[model samples]
Target: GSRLPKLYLCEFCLKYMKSRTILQQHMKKCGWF
Candidate 1:
């Protein structure tokens, strides 16, 4: 079975995220978190 893509929200910034892992990686690189 295919797993549903997860969604995440930045608790510090209140931003909507489509993928938590990807979002975290982006935040780490850009220092947005």
Candidate 2:
């Protein structure tokens, strides 16, 4: 079984998120946002 979650990589901060939606949220507060 695969337990991989949808991952989002932040280009500016080099962070990993659960999904694109969450990534966008991080961008909002990100310095590169």
User: Clashes per prediction?
Assistant: 0, 0
Candidate 2: segments with Cα more than 4 A from true spot: 1-6
lDDT (C-alpha) at residue 26 in model 1:
59
Which 10-residue window of candidate 1 scores lowest in summed lDDT? 5-14
Candidate 2's residue-wise lDDT over 1-33, tens digit each?
Answer: 598765798877888988899889898778553
After superposition of all CA atoms, the RMSD between model 1 and the true structure is 5.4
List CA RMSD, all candidates.
5.4, 3.0
Residue 22 error for model 1, in Å? 1.8
> Against the true structure, candidate 2 has what lDDT?
0.80
Measured by lDDT, the strongest candidate is 2
CA error at residue 26 for candidate 1, angstroms: 4.2
User: Which residue ranges in model 1 land beyond 4 Å of their true spot?
Assistant: 1-6, 26-33
The C-alpha lDDT values of all candidates are 0.68, 0.80
